[PDB]
Design a protein around this ligand. Sequence first.
Ligand SMILES: [C]C1=C([C])[C]=C2C(=[C]1)N([C][C]([O])[C]([O])[C]([O])[C]OP([O])(=O)OP([O])(=O)O[C][C]1O[C](N3[C]=NC4=C3N=[C]N=C4[N])[C]([O])[C]1[O])C1=NC(=O)[N]C(=O)C1=N2[C]([C][C]=O)C1=C(O[C]C2=C(F)N=[C][C]=[C]2)C(F)=[C]C(F)=[C]1
Length: 645
Amino acid sequence: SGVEGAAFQSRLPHDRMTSQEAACFPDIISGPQQTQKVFLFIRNRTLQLWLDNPKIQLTFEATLQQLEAPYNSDTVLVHRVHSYLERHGLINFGIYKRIKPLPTKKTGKVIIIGSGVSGLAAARQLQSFGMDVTLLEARDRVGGRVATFRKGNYVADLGAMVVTGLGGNPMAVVSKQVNMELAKIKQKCPLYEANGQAVPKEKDEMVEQEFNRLLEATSYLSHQLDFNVLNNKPVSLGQALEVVIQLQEKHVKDEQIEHWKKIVKTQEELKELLNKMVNLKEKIKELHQQYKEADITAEFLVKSKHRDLTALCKEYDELAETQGKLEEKLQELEANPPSDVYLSSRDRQILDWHFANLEFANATPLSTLSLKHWDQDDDFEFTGSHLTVRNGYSCVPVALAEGLDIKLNTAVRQVRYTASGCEVIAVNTRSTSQTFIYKCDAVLCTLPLGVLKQQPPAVQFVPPLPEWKTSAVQRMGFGNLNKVVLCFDRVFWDPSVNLFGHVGSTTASRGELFLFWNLYKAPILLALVAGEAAGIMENISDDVIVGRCLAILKGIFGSSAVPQPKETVVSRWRADPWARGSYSYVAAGSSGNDYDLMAQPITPPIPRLFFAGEHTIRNYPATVHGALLSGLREAGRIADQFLGA
Ligand SMILES: [C]C1=C([C])[C]=C2C(=[C]1)N([C][C]([O])[C]([O])[C]([O])[C]OP([O])(=O)OP([O])(=O)O[C][C]1O[C](N3[C]=NC4=C3N=[C]N=C4[N])[C]([O])[C]1[O])C1=NC(=O)[N]C(=O)C1=N2[C]([C][C]=O)C1=C(O[C]C2=C(F)N=[C][C]=[C]2)C(F)=[C]C(F)=[C]1
């Protein structure tokens, strides 16, 4: 439905109030049910008005004007709802034409550290709320972990690049505002072994289904059997995976043993039976000779000896009858061995490709993920197909930058906060002699977790952060993932597939150049470096890593089909001092609760230091939309503090 759709698109239950809304509207929850239903219609319809046309600001007046009777009659309640939705960034977020021009007098000075998606989102909110906002950004560009390369006709994203489903996704609004060219991804993904041979369909499917089985089993171990702590250590996903593979191998070796035991027993029965038939032939040779050695006692001796001979012959025919039903049991046993091994060497390499794919998705070796909690955010996935940004994801943060006071090449080195306000100190990256001191009422830190983890610290906090916050920083995972961009003058791959796989030869190197994407109009290929390989590969020069790409591609399509690339680019997210990795993951011994701790502001009294970024939002970590939502959350929190809730 339409207004139900608006609630769903806002990640809200269309038919009940959230706890957050109960807090802000306690008179509604305690009042009659009828008024609660009126509240919900006001909320849903306001969201619908905004979502149907997010390119312009939705004002209170226009909300009142577009409500049908009787709802356009309860003006006070309508205003209460509009104000709440706006303050929480559920309407009038992103980039839109203002109806009310910006207030000329500001209220409060906010420094935003970082011009990534979270910092930009907060800046636009706070600027809309009438505050003085300045962004300090260490790079020479906006977007942070959204990073688009452009050269000639080539466009390619080195950081984020996928919009997951639009249903419920706030990026669906931003897409409409910015004109992102999104394109659905085709799901077919052929695999090629390290020799360039295609993985046959049956092997592709067999190994994939086993991957699904093993993984569901780790989840059963974790959430049914509570196998989460061992020898005082938290179990990792990698650890659980090794255990379930060990049990399959044990099972194969057992059925093999059971089968050899059946073989041996049948051989032993045949050995004995043949020995027994031997002795019955010997007995018949003896009677057949005493049958030729032969009166009334003789006429009766032949009758009796024929009776004896043909009875031993009937004994012998019944034993050769058992002899046949046994050596046919033997024949069919020798023809149906169970599997010699659980995974053939090739099967194992392909399976390591699926593990690598998972290390891509989580940006970290499987041996680091918390078994119990690595996918705690699964329940919040958006609906609809995933898409890629054909015109480059930088289109989003560049649009978010319009009108913001952004000082680029301004690297924060120290953050001071007291009960009287804050000071941020920064240097010019083109001249680290030049120093700047920014006083403000509040600091919003969107520094990546990797930068916060840096020892010795890149940015120093004064006073130092509390233990409950720093140990949360320490506990959380911060992964890595890299891309190689290959620009050619001709397309030699299958244009109708967006993905294809290179199966690495070893477990340790399973993440090396394992997945290739063709996602664009122009002849571009991205090859991913995941897992253990990601950090190690940063130490390889560009030309050499491209060469290894080219060798893989020449193996698959033929050496003469692969020309020299016209342009190449290589990400090194771990070595990037403004990233120090790609995005958080739930490390073994952490949990969603650490993401909640990260969002918590510090108070030295009133809060001064605030936190946003993908690492602060429990239900949507490690994503652009989660960063965005986190910026919206902190903008609401800061405005509630400094302008009143
Ligand atoms: C890195 C990365 C990559 C490579 C990729 C990706 C990613 C990443 N992701 C994530 C995102 O990006 C995040 O979440 C965001 O970004 C967040 O944000 P924030 O928070 O805001 O942060 P930043 O940006 O960084 O910002 C901050 C700032 O700050 C600054 N600084 C520093 N230092 C300093 C400063 N300033 C001053 N001072 C000082 N000292 C910096 O510089 C900055 O600026 C993502 N996401 C999403 O959503 N999407 C996507 O797409 C992504 N990605 C990925 C990963 C995983 O796997 C993903 C995916 O995949 C896709 C693909 C690719 F990528 N490639 C190829 C193919 C495909 C998917 F699918 C999904 C997802 F979810 C993810």
